[PDB]
Curated annotation (Swiss-Prot):
Keywords: Acetylation, Cell membrane, Cytoplasm, Membrane, Metal-binding, Transferase, Zinc. Zn(2+) binds at C286, C332, H333. Coiled coil: none annotated. The lineage of its organism: Eukaryota, Metazoa, Chordata, Craniata, Vertebrata. It comes from Homo sapiens (Human). It comes from the Eukaryota. This is Glutathione S-transferase LANCL1. Gene3D superfamilies: 1.50.10.10. It is found in: Cytoplasm; Cell membrane. One of its GO terms (cellular component) is cytoplasm. SMART domains: LANC_like.
């Protein structure tokens, strides 16, 4: 029900029981060889499902709201997917689809928000790379400025992913990475980063977090912990070398901020939506382990401390037991986004255990629509619906190169 679901007390209620046996050499063989390549048999199934889901999607998208051009939910999100598909399959039709969707997303600008997922940066960044790939430096170049100018329209922006500053820097990195050369000046990046550090210590002082955690952030009347709207989101981005936080400030400001977060962990290994929350039940990217894990793995890469890695292992385990949601198959809060957590661990560790788990989740998705889940609100969108699921399946094809999209870097 909508409404009154009794799945309110603890996270086991929100998940189907994971029916897959856990990793061993025999069971792994079927999905990949020792080099961690997917057996052609297995890839064939993925590709076959990908191909067919696209028909459903392409068909459904004929009914999508013409007005919504966002990454999350809107047109730019579909463009994002198609560009990724063109990269994995080489099929020119995908580049043409991507062009067509970008065009739609360009008629949806509102100068309201600065993010990739929910703001105008989505259509802009995505357009810029899409024009680049169609050797069109007229539009692409002009687009880039239109995105550079974009931040001026909200000096009091939040700092999180869906509406905040980092969500804007993603648009910025997207372009840089996909172009090859530094198309956005690193100055433009650092100074926005600077304004998010200083903003984070001011808030921790206006509050008395300053002792407990040198940095603090809030969105819409809460101290959000998770990836979508919260701290793990922000710190992950701050510990990113791309953003270049002085080794100094890195250790004195952000490290213990992160340590604060880790210490919020439930006894289960999961993480509260916000500070003070006592209900341990959301196993999503947006809220819970699946979004917090990116922070842990990065902290490990940056500070090489056993406890970070060790906490991230703990996440994986939670998600293995509880990551098949009755909520559906999506990226934001669904089975597919959850599986990226395994891939991320795998690509740090090389532990084939974690590639294996992704494949078994993938396996759950080849049964898309058999488990009796609710149909998502935008049933074909990147973050709520089918597009993300497809996105993940395609991304799984070359495990080593897989990133959680619009976020991971
Ligand atoms: Zn969500």
């Amino acid at each position: 029900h909508h409404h009154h679901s009794m799945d309110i007390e603890f996270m086991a209620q929100r998940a189907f029981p994971n029916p897959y046996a856990d990793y061993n050499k025999s069971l792994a063989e079927g999905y990949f060889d020792a080099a961690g390549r997917l057996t052609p048999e297995f890839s064939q199934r993925l590709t076959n499902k990908i191909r067919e889901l696209l028909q459903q999607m392409e068909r459904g998208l004929k009914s999508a709201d013409p007005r919504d051009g966002t990454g999350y939910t809107g047109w730019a999100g579909i463009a994002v997917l198609y560009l990724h598909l063109y990269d994995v399959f080489g099929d020119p039709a995908y580049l043409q689809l991507a062009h067509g969707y970008v065009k739609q997303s360009l008629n949806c600008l509102t100068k309201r928000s600065i993010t990739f997922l929910c703001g105008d940066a989505g259509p802009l960044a995505v357009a810029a790379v899409l024009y680049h790939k169609m050797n069109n430096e007229k539009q692409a170049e002009d687009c880039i400025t239109r995105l550079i100018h974009l931040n001026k329209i909200d000096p009091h922006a939040p700092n999180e992913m869906l509406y905040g500053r980092i969500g804007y820097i993603y648009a910025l990195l997207f372009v840089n990475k996909n172009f090859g050369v530094e198309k956005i000046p690193q100055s433009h990046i650092q100074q926005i980063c600077e304004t998010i550090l200083t903003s984070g210590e001011n808030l921790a002082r206006k509050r008395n977090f300053t002792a407990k955690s040198p940095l603090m952030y809030e969105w819409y009347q809460e101290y959000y912990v998770g990836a979508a709207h919260g701290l793990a989101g922000i710190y992950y981005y701050l510990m990113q070398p791309s953003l270049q936080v002085s080794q100094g400030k890195l250790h004195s400001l952000v490290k213990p901020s992160v340590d604060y977060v880790c210490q919020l962990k439930f006894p289960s290994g999961n993480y509260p939506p916000c500070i003070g929350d006592n209900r341990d039940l959301l196993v999503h990217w947006c809220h819970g382990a699946p979004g917090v894990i990116y922070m842990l793995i990065q902290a490990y890469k940056v500070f090489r401390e056993e406890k970070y890695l060790c906490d991230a292992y703990q996440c994986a385990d939670v998600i293995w037991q509880y990551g098949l949601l009755k909520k559906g198959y999506g990226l934001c809060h669904g089975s597919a986004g959850n599986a990226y957590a395994f891939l991320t661990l795998y690509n740090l560790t090389q532990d084939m255990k974690y590639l294996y788990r992704a494949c078994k989740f993938a396996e759950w998705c080849l049964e898309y629509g058999e488990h009796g889940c609710r149909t998502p609100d935008t049933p074909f969108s990147l973050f709520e619906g089918m597009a993300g699921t497809i996105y993940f399946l395609a991304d799984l094809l070359v495990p080593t190169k897989a990133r959680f999209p619009a976020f991971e870097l």
